[PDB]
């Protein structure tokens, strides 16, 4: 999920944008 | 500012800022 991708590892704009509605 | 380790309120603030008026879903567990 986003924790693994952005907290446990370095986030990206791509990943964050995946969670925008 | 997104290319780092973003945890907790920190991560939520990044979603908030990047998503704007679209909104986002924050599912820490799934
Ligand atoms: Na990552």
């Amino acid at each position: 999920g986003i924790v693994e991708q952005c907290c446990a590892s370095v986030c990206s704009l791509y990943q964050l944008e995946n969670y925008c509605n | 500012f997104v290319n780092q380790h973003l945890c907790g309120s920190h991560l939520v603030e990044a979603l908030y800022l990047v998503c704007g008026e679209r909104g986002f879903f924050y599912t820490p567990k799934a």
Side-chain angles (χ1 to χ4, degrees), chain A, chain B residues 1-28 30:
Chain A
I2 195 174
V3 177
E4 303 66 36
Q5 289 321 308
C6 281
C7 170
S9 41
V10 175
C11 204
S12 78
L13 176 59
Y14 177 102
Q15 228 94 255
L16 280 180
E17 268 189 346
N18 273 345
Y19 307 92
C20 296
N21 289 137
Chain B
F1 65 98
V2 304
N3 306 103
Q4 47 179 307
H5 299 266
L6 296 182
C7 301
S9 70
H10 306 219
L11 181 52
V12 167
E13 175 165 289
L15 277 167
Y16 174 72
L17 289 174
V18 159
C19 296
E21 63 171 68
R22 280 164 80 185
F24 55 94
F25 61 82
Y26 172 63
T27 65

